[PDB]
Amino acid sequence: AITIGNKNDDKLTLWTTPDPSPNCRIHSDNDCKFTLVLTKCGSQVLATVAALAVSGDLSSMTGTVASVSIFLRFDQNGVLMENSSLKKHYWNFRNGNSTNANPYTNAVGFMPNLLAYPKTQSQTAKNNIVSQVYLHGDKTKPMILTITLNGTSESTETSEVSTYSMSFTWSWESGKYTTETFATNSYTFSYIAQE
Amino acid sequence: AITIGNKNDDKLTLWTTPDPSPNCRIHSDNDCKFTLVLTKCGSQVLATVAALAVSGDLSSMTGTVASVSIFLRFDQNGVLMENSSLKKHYWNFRNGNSTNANPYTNAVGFMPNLLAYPKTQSQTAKNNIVSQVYLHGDKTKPMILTITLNGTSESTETSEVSTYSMSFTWSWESGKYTTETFATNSYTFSYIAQE
Amino acid sequence: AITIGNKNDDKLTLWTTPDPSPNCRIHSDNDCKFTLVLTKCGSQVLATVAALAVSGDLSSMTGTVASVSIFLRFDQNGVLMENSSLKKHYWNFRNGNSTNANPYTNAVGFMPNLLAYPKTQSQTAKNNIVSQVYLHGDKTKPMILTITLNGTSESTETSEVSTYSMSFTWSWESGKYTTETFATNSYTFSYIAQE
């Protein structure tokens, strides 16, 4: 027998699990299944992200703005902070198709590099990754995905100041898609790691 | 001397070779040179894909639908099945710029994760990766590339039921590009691996 | 304590540093901060690229063509040649957030595969990666990014004939963006490596 592709270092994956139960808030608690897989590839992190609403249509989860934003804040050790859209319970390194039972204490190797992507309140172009994507994979329902690395995705709130952060913001033309269910296609990106 | 980038584990690449001879069927046998390189990066597979028609223009390789679809079906061990667009001969792990002479018997580490991307006849958004691409790199000739992971790309045909699968479907506006030669730009994507 | 993502082989990264000082020429010396990080992932290189003008607006750095091109030429050992937009000083393998003090002498493992992407004066589709991107991440200011691998990005100039090469060309509608500052979002791509 010849087995190929049989090397997979569990500590080089940080993920929500590949098939998360409701684990994220867009507008209301647990109204979204947010899938995010981060794989460390030396000085870069290779990532795949997907989001699925589970509690209603877009009008029910948006205010007056035609956007959905999911933000992740991390402390100086790369640990997920409470002021994040994503719940911490099943955000950890890999164990099979789940997370390891012991929470990580340092994930700085997965954080966006602060020299490449500084903390700032300015919309520095390099801090963002911006692409046209499609709601439900439908060519007639375009959206813009803006990933922010550190920068404007950082929290500055008193007592909950993040060191690293990333946000995922899908935006579209005002007035459109109010009766649609929010569901994105899998999307690949990479970023420079802090270490 | 200082040599960098000099680590390349042959068993962590599964490919058509980087420069395949005609090895794929879109409409007729061997009418396409399909290049696909899968590199295992822990829990994700990093991939680059390109397609080139070698036997005629789009009108000669399409029916009444403005699309080209290339599908790969794999058994429970990740071995390529006969009901695939791609020929098996030169689909294997790497040996220089070619394939190793001994066919793999297990490539489950390169297969799309079934929990992330289930088998289904529904068009689940997460199972797909959808992007606007350009025929011949021409901005005036857009197409939509839809990559399907498991899901609707799976075969359910009696005696040829796949366990894993992926499809690549380029689609465009009906009536356009009939006299063009099908040739795509290299395209990068990643997906969550089964193990 | 449990530290994850703590493996990073310095020799598997070739970069401009994550936060380069002016190190590139678009129209005039050092008028651009060009960030490029290449990470070797077996038979593929995973890359992230960003560009920022530091000396003026687009009208000041373009002629009669609505494009910006940044080209990298490499010799047979993968060493950066003088006929490149990018300066050589801080183009090397990693040392922390900087480059190692000793210049590499061989980086063929990071070069675009010549069988996949041949040297040619024809615009072969597979040699290119072509995507719609946005100036300053603004949906109303689209551009086309065309990455060329070997192919038409190769230099053929007497005495400065490259073996490998890559170019990054952003193009847009003639007459637009003359008063804008050139600043791109981070962009991810991969390509097949020579070895």
DSSP-derived secondary structure for B150-173 = SGGGS---TT---SEEEEEEEE--
- B61, containing H or E segment: helix B58-61
CATH T-level fold of A1-195: Adenovirus Type 5 Fiber Protein (Receptor Binding Domain) (2.60.90)
Tokens representing A155 are 């929290």
Tokens representing B123 are 């068009």
- Closest CB from C123, C125, C195 relative to B184: C125
* Conformational region of residue C24, where left means phi above 0, alpha means psi within -120 to 50, and beta covers everything else: beta
- Closest CB from B14, B125, B190 relative to A48: B190
If you compute the radius of gyration of chain A from its CA atoms, what whole number of angstroms results?
Answer: 17
- C59, containing H or E segment: helix C58-61
Please return the burial class of C28, using the count of CB atoms within 10 Å of its CB with bins 0-12, 13-18 and 19+: exposed
Measured distance CA(B108)–CA(B114) in Å, rounded: 11
- Closest CB from B18, B131, B185 relative to C113: B18
Q: Which residue type does A19 have?
A: D
Q: Is A50 helix (H, G, I), strand (E, B) or coil?
A: strand
- Closest CB from A5, A35, A134 relative to B40: A5
Tally of residues, chain A:
195
Subunit partners of chain A (3 or more CB pairs within 8 A): B, C
Measured distance CA(B33)–CA(B177) in Å, rounded: 19
CA-nearest of A15, A124, B186 to C185 is A124
Cα nearest neighbour of B3 on chain C:
C106
The domain locations on chain C are: 1-195
Question: Cβ contacts (< 8 Å) between A192 and chain C: which residues?
Answer: 18, 37, 48
CA-nearest of A191, A184, A175, A164 to A66 is A175
Q: Which residues of B touch C (CB under 8 A)?
A: 1-9, 12-13, 15, 17-19, 35, 37, 39-41, 46-48, 50, 52, 94, 97, 131-134, 136-137, 139, 183-188
Question: What Å resolution does this PDB entry report?
Answer: 1.5
Q: Is C43 helix (H, G, I), strand (E, B) or coil?
A: coil
Interface size A-C, in CB pairs within 8 Å, comes to 131
* Residue A89 exposure: Cα atoms within 13 Å on the Cβ side: 8
Structural determination approach = X-ray
Phi and psi for C152 in degrees, rounded to 5? -70, -5
**Residue B103 CB partners (closer than 8 Å, separation 6+):** A2, B88, B92
Measured distance CA(B70)–CA(B33) in Å, rounded: 11
Q: Do B3 and C106 touch (CB under 8 A)?
A: yes
- E-strand ranges in B8-154 read 13-15, 32-41, 44-53, 67-74, 92-95, 98-99, 128-134, 142-149
- Closest CB from A43, A102, A105 relative to C39: A43
Interface probe, candidates C192, C194, C195, chain B, greatest B C-beta count within 10 A: C192
Cα nearest neighbour of C103 on chain B:
B2
Closest-CA distance, C160 to chain A, in angstroms, reads 31
Interface probe, candidates B39, B79, B106, B130, chain A, greatest A C-beta count within 10 A: B130
**Residue C164 CB partners (closer than 8 Å, separation 6+):** C73, C74, C78, C108, C111, C112, C114, C150, C154, C194
Measured distance CA(C102)–CA(B158) in Å, rounded: 61
Rounded to the nearest 10 degrees, how much is the dihedral formed by the CA atoms of C81, B37, A168, B125? Answer: 150
Measured distance CA(A134)–CA(A136) in Å, rounded: 6
Tokens representing B40 are 């295992």
Closest-CA distance, B44 to chain A, in angstroms, reads 7
Measured distance CA(C100)–CA(C70) in Å, rounded: 24
